[PDB]
A paper describes a structure:
STING plays essential roles coordinating innate immune responses to processes that range from pathogenic infection to genomic instability. Its adaptor function is activated by cyclic dinucleotide (CDN) secondary messengers originating from self (2’3’-cGAMP) or bacterial sources (3’3’-CDNs). Different classes of CDNs possess distinct binding modes, stabilizing STING’s ligand-binding domain (LBD) in either a closed or open conformation. Here, we explore the conformational and oligomeric states of full-length human STING in the presence of closed-LBD (SR-717) and open-LBD (diABZI-3) non-nucleotide agonists, lending insight into potentially distinct modes of activation.
Using 3D classification, we parsed out two distinct conformations from this class. In the second conformation (the apart conformation), there are six fully resolved STING molecules. On the opposing side, the central STING molecules still interact via the α2–α3 loop in the LBD, but the TMDs are splayed apart and instead interact with their other lateral neighbors. To maintain this linear arrangement, dimeric units of STING are intermittently separated by breaks in TMD interactions as seen in the apart structure. The average distance between the α1 helices, as defined by the distance between the Cα atom of H185, in the together and apart conformations is 42.3 Å, which is roughly 10 Å shorter than in apo STING and 6 Å longer than the SR-717 complex.
Numbering used by the authors:
A (entry chain I), D (entry chain K): 5 to 188, 192 to 227, 238 to 317, 323 to 333
B (entry chain J), C (entry chain L), E (entry chain F): 5 to 110, 116 to 188, 192 to 227, 238 to 317, 323 to 333
């Protein structure tokens, strides 16, 4: 909600679509009136074949993982087996069910047991070699945003743990001291962290818009926060402690280099994700309680207008 | 390499396994000896079913992304369809070819309904789950890991700004004071357990603080290294704060960052910091990384690198 | 009564629902008018199958606790069997009667093997899930809560030691001072959001710190109760520290305790603390519990109870 | 590990036994060689009946949870439905599967759809009213321990957050200062916390055993901690900051009161669980960086011997 | 956008031309409707002949690089074979498959000898020469250009080191100058004709040299911009010395750098310099590129950008 261009967390729309598709398929099956015994047997055989294919792919992965057991898996074999096949005992039970219900049940549509196993191994080898069973970017994004497999996650958490959680307490006291000592307008008691989505972070904040102009270094493990006054049609509508977000600058510098594999599309994606994650952390932090305000913006507009409307 | 516990980049053992499995499958198919027209039809049907399942999964993902199209994909349907279904042209051609072969190769709509029901059950319950090893491999290949971002930010923000002047400051200190020669390399420690005391001396009594390097300010601390009570050497010891941040991430509940994930990302962070510092112009053998896993004397490990 | 958003203890709505379901079942069996012998035979068979499934689940539980027998049950097999199978004599008699009826009522070993397989599948995959509402009801009934312990500790540890002396010290401060006299009741605030600032001024500027009560010392404070900028009274304001403890528990990842559970336990803590203080011999209406949920004027809410 | 009587966390042995039983059942089925389609159909129908019974139980639970919607569920029906029927879409899909399979598949042993529904409703009503489906205490304890549904966990976390986390940092400095002043042996730099499993906590630690005697009050929120010395055959072999665990005292007081429903067997179980939870928290917490040691004991034995052996 | 004569990056017009050609071929095949077996056999034979010709060309290339194996490829035969034969596995499989079709489809040795002779004549006389358009496309695809190196060196050596301090020096001179403030940007001139005078006075009398910026001895210059004989502003004009380097390169005979190539590389240099400066962190709109070619008024062109 910081900016309309920042994505929201993934919902359960896929589950709802799956439920609707299941209902439609059930309605079609009831309408056609085909025998249900064949339907159940074929569905069980299909699921058994899928489980056996997953087993074969997991074994193929285990073949390479066995050389990583000493380093990535603390020298334990059951850990590697679980990482290759998911839950060990549940998958084993599913495999036993597959074996029992394929070696016994009739197979009108499907190969015989050992011939089916050979053909399925051939198909799995073809999938591994040619990469047919790949992951579309939607699934990769969902996995990344579910298990927190990102770089924006790391950058935002580092920003909170290292810088914000350290200056948020003393910020109010220092602002109050500056207001009391110097009787020359008023200063808002919240640091406004700017979040340029396009990751364009100049070293000089005043160059973003001439209205934002530096006024004074806020008096004081040595944090220097330059305060800026906001000119509205040439008149100072107020002043505030304003600064950029350095993780966005590090994201941009990551995109510049060639040892990152981090392109402009990925840079913008991570900028949006970092802004959202920092919003979450600051919303649910004890230090950030009417203390700091995030101002996310994408240049298509003047910065002073948004800073003032948030003021 | 950096440490025996640090996982080396993934090898091609999966390709060797695929080759072995392909050889075994060819051997057994030749042994059984059945006409290949039936095999071809069955395999084409299998790929057709797999492609139809992928299409249904993409349809569900499209229904999910209908509410994120305007923000994630700049409000363009082409990007959303490509994200949910892979490459548009390639996947579309593959699905069309599979459908044509499926219709040509000898119930017609009943099979489609059964396949749709099976895919809906797979998506809802989650039978075809992604194994943790596959997820880790994909994330590492695509640089979708937290440690990569943390290490790159560490290099860009702190290392790149102090390494050029570290040698100059060390030389100034050496020409300003003597015995006691400080090493010209920043010995960055990488404790894989991620338990970092706020002071080196607290972590190990064999390590003593000596002085502070001359200096935004960048204060560095030169430490005394002890052995049997005698000073063996002095180096600019400095913990890698990204590991402390990983530990704090694992502490909080909002991160969803488990201890096993913490150790794995510590290993990845050390490895990618090695990779970054290997080719970094600012790194000219003036910064040596030390990785140690307590099952230990830290001072002995530091000296072994001297 | 304490707050509209605090859940009252569960009544017997499930009993009414069961009665309605039983009445509907009687109505529908009367409507069909099926012979009762077959109905009874099938009901007994279903109950025997459920008993056998419970027996197999208890066998699996006993296999699990065979290694815990030394600690959980002090090396006693009888207690282990009772824990894994409920009442020993009653469950044993019920299982024996069910087996006898199943043998008498008209495959036998095939059905037993299939029932064992079904129970193994239920235990492995986890089809027989537990409803979260049922889990919450069981926890509330059997005191398997966290807020229960939190509130009992807060009452026993702190309230029980200050409530007798709070009125005496309030009176001492009243006679020491002059005319609005401080209220002789403790207005313990209970912010259900669990976000407690260290100072009341930060929570609400209209509330101001005024003085400290005279004294193993409890430094209870006396605050200015400003309405429209004028002091309408004086009393002792004191946050509930178990709320801060629950907040810190929700913050950490080593608690298995989420924000939804945090609000749930704040509700339960307020409810059971009020229940304890209602019957507390030390409490003689000398401490008034004030609770609120932020959607708010704190000073006006406090003045309402004044 | 602290004491042989403290129960270890539940392992996956239950699933191991389940897999063993499944293998035995599969072997038995293969030996009998009954028509596999009959077995699969019967299993599907049994699972459908179980799902329908769970649906009826969830509906009955909702019938009482709906009156708590305004307070316990923040006034939302979706929350109540989710809390009564588990995951909404997954449970709905399972229910639709059960309905479709029962309405279509033949059943040699099984009532017709409406008559089966009536009989299952009667059985569910009987189970609810009479409590026939009695939850054995072992599974109740397993669920409570898995989901942190025990007062011991809350008391341990409160003990850590309120008291230990505020004194453990400065404890080392205070002990070092006291050692600097009074050179009259040396005091251990680790706080020892006594855990009486019998929940018998006297007000004075000295009266617990003659060999333990209070020496001096450690100089400093008043965190006055009394140091105690150990009389090994009349000699002060060691001295340390020793005190009881007040959560165990509160547990004993709870057991004394009749308004807690907190019996003696439950008191012992909760004492053990509190000890183990505090062990875990101190093991992983940063403040307890080899700063505190827990001495858990149960009187069937001298306390001083255990304290010395831990020293 | 920098200049009308600056070429845009190569598009995909050839893809559209191929689409039109394919459409015409499909239309004529549908119109004629000749049997497809002969068409397939002829096309397969033609493709196999093309593959065999490429194989023979690669064999000759390998015979050439048998002496460069130890210099260009560090003494590894596999890299040399890949260089002379494209992707090893893909092209090897293509050649094997083409051979398999060629043998399967029905003299044979005479055809192979004739194909070898045709390849020998193609290589010796260079019939399959690379048109300059294809060479330019490959160079712009793989970034094989003199302009690329020149612009990258200009950015990394000069612009990246003077863009930051230029604005500070300009601000100092602005709060040092009594009388029109100088612009805060570097107005780099990019004369596409590459005829650069040693001074701006010779370029146009309407532009006057005024002063030297305070100072690495970069020592930029500030000029007077005369409009109608009166000063309209002052900017830090500064030629692009890589253009002079390109001109001097074209002058000499050892460069192999004709005037056409000189103009092409000047245009490419300007385009890639703009591309680099667009994403350059040091560029904060403090350096405005100016390009101009006489079919001209330099002073008016500079005033337009103000
Ligand atoms: C960013 C690189 N990085 N990635 C990861 C992962 C870890 C690190 C890392 O190690 N950084 C770091 N370590 C230092 C140690 C010393 C020293 N003397 O030892 C000196 C340094 O440079 C001053 C140090 N720096 C760089 C600057 C750091 C701290 N800092 C930040 N941080 C971030 O923005 C940020 C981005 C991301 C992502 N995560 N974070 C949080 C860390 N913003 C600041 C704004 C102001 C201002 N407005 O004035 C002043 C600051 O510094 C004053 C505090 C100095 N204290 C710091 C700790 O205690 C000793 C010295 C600010
Ligand atoms: C809270 C953590 N925790 N969870 C469980 C379970 C057990 C404990 C625990 O161990 N607590 C504890 N033990 C101590 C021992 C010493 C010592 N020197 O030995 C010193 C301490 O700190 C001063 C001790 N503390 C913390 C302070 C505690 C008592 N106290 C509380 N109570 C709670 O908040 C609370 C929350 C929940 C839930 N349950 N409770 C009841 C305990 N509110 C207070 C408000 C004031 C004020 N502003 O006026 C002053 C207080 O105490 C001043 C000194 C009184 N003391 C002196 C020593 O004897 C005991 C009494 C207050
Ligand atoms: C839903 C439905 C009816 C369906 O559409 N298919 C696709 C399909 C084929 F794959 C193959 C042939 C026909 C159809 Cl029609 C399917 C498959 C099975 C099954 O058991 N496949 C086992 C199996 C193979 F068939 C080939 C193989 F190489 C390995 C393997 F392990 C069950 C039900 C279905
Ligand atoms: C696994 C297997 C073979 C099994 O062991 N039983 C136990 C059992 C009975 F319950 C009932 C009779 C015999 C057996 Cl033998 C079972 C039941 C069904 C079934 O459909 N039960 C519907 C159903 C009822 F019959 C009575 C009722 F009150 C509600 C109800 F919902 C399917 C498969 C099995």
């Amino acid at each position: 909600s910081l900016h309309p261009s920042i994505p929201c967390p993934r919902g359960h729309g896929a589950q709802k679509a799956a439920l609707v598709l299941l209902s439609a398929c059930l309605v079609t099956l009831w309408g056609l009136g085909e025998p249900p015994e064949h339907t159940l047997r074929y569905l069980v055989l299909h699921l058994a074949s899928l489980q056996l294919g997953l087993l074969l792919n997991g074994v193929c992965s285990l073949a390479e993982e066995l050389r990583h057991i000493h380093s990535r898996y603390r020298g334990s074999y059951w850990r590697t087996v679980r990482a290759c096949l998911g839950c060990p005992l549940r998958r084993g039970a599913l495999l036993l069910l597959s074996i029992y219900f394929y070696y016994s049940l009739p197979n009108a549509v499907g190969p015989p047991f050992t011939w089916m196993l050979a053909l399925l191994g051939l198909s799995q080898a073809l999938n591994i070699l040619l990469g047919l069973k790949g992951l579309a970017p939607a699934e990769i994004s969902a996995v990344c945003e579910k298990g927190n497999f990102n770089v924006a996650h790391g950058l935002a958490w580092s920003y909170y743990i290292g810088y914000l959680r350290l200056i948020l307490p003393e910020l109010q006291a220092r602002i109050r001291t500056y207001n009391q000592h110097y009787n020359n307008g008023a200063v808002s008691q919240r640091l406004y962290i700017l979040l340029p989505l396009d990751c364009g972070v100049p070293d000089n904040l005043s160059m973003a818009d001439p209205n934002i102009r530096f006024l004074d270094k806020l008096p004081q493990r040595v944090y220097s926060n330059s305060i800026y006054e906001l000119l509205e049609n040439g008149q100072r509508a107020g002043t505030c402690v304003l600064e950029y977000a350095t993780p966005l600058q590090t994201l941009f510098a990551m995109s510049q280099y060639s040892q990152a594999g981090f392109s402009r599309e990925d840079r913008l994606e991570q900028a949006k994700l970092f802004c959202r994650t920092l919003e979450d952390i600051l919303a649910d932090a004890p230090e950030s309680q009417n203390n700091c305000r995030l101002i996310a913006y994408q240049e298509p507009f003047s910065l002073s207008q948004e800073v003032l409307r948030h003021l």
